Design a protein around this ligand. Structure first.
Ligand SMILES: C[C@@H](O)[C@H](NC(=O)OP(=O)(O)OC[C@H]1O[C@@H](n2cnc3c(N)ncnc32)[C@H](O)[C@@H]1O)C(=O)O
Ligand SMILES: [Mg+2]
Length: 321
């Protein structure tokens, strides 16, 4: 019997958080907001509880979980070799950044890290997440709140779609600020490696780390709707595509809304953060509009839209370059 408890994002009712903390202590899984996407979390030191996350998501065991912390002191408990990067961390944490370090803790079971000698760590800039972790007293292991393969939940409506009846508690703090998962940066190798683009933008990381490596899998290509998805990087072929795929809905920017008939406006190029904020909602709307094909306009591989494109490329059933 899933309880959905609404809380203020800045000053959440600590009584709701306590209820959540209790469930975590009982080895239950709960869903909570962050500034990026909703997470589905368990006690990070509880092997059995973390196993439930995999079951509930229908997730491969080889796909490791991000461990969420509230203090730099917790970092010492779980990781080693981070001391040269403390200046960096203190500049972006709390915030939408996940970093890979060598695993110290034997407190974090292998299921969490998929037997890897590394651990992904994030200190989320969302008062609800921070206050929950602190009150609970252990780190929380949490992937995104969605059935594996599907778009990451950015609001409680999407969470309910995927998890009503399957978890005891969803904390609702409204639509997540960014709409997109944290930037993941691997700091275990000699040169830092970008594993996932996010709200900490590539251009910013390149300023800080001139030798940042951006693997091919980041630039090429999860987050997938139920209907086939057609991504159109070259918008001159838009007309060809529309006519090739007749029974369709289009996801488009505002400045090209008038150029279609059946269209979801995801946001404006004027304010690209609007596009990031709404893109996953758009895919969930689209898949329900009773059309055979979802057709999405492409975006610049720059700033936050880089992250958007990363997500769409990984979701698309066909790309049109
Ligand atoms: C809940 C919210 O904080 C959200 N979490 C999230 O997106 O979790 P998830 O859906 O599990 O994505 C986790 C990603 O993190 C990577 N990952 C985790 N631990 C890793 C490790 N030790 N080495 C490399 N990649 C790792 C996984 O491969 C995967 O791509 C976020 O990071 O914004
Ligand atoms: Mg995910």
């Amino acid at each position: 019997s899933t309880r959905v408890l609404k809380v203020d994002p800045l000053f959440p009712d600590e009584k709701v958080l306590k209820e959540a903390a209790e469930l975590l202590r009982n080895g239950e899984v709960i869903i909570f907001p962050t500034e990026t996407v909703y997470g589905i979390g368990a006690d990070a030191y509880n092997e059995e509880a973390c196993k439930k996350i995999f079951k509930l998501k229908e997730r491969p065991a080889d796909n490791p979980l991000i461990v969420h912390i509230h203090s730099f002191k917790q970092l010492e408990e779980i990781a080693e070799g981070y001391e040269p990067h403390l200046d960096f961390l203190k500049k972006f944490w709390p915030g939408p950044l996940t970093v890979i370090f060598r695993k110290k803790s034997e407190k974090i079971p292998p299921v969490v890290t998929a037997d890897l000698p590394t651990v992904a760590v994030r200190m989320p800039a969302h008062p609800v997440a921070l206050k929950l972790i602190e009150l609970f007293g252990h780190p929380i292991a949490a992937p995104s709140a969605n059935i594996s393969g599907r778009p990451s939940a950015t609001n409680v409506k999407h969470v309910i779609e995927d998890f009503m009846g399957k978890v005891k508690l969803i904390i609702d703090a409204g639509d997540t600020p960014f709409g997109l998962e944290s930037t993941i940066v691997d700091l275990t190798k000699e040169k830092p490696v970008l594993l996932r683009p996010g709200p900490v933008e590539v251009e910013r990381l390149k300023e800080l780390f001139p030798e940042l490596v951006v693997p091919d899998f980041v630039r090429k290509g999860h987050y997938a709707p139920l209907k086939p998805l057609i991504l159109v990087e070259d918008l001159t072929k838009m007309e060809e595509v529309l006519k090739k795929y007749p029974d369709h809905v289009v996801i488009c920017v505002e400045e090209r809304k008038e150029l279609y008939d059946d269209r979801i406006v995801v946001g404006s190029l004027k304010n690209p953060y609007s596009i990031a904020q709404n893109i996953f909602s758009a895919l969930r709307e689209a898949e329900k509009m009773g059309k055979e094909y979802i057709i999405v306009e492409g975006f610049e591989e720059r700033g936050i839209l880089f992250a958007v494109m990363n997500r769409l490329r990984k979701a698309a059933t066909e790309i049109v370059r």
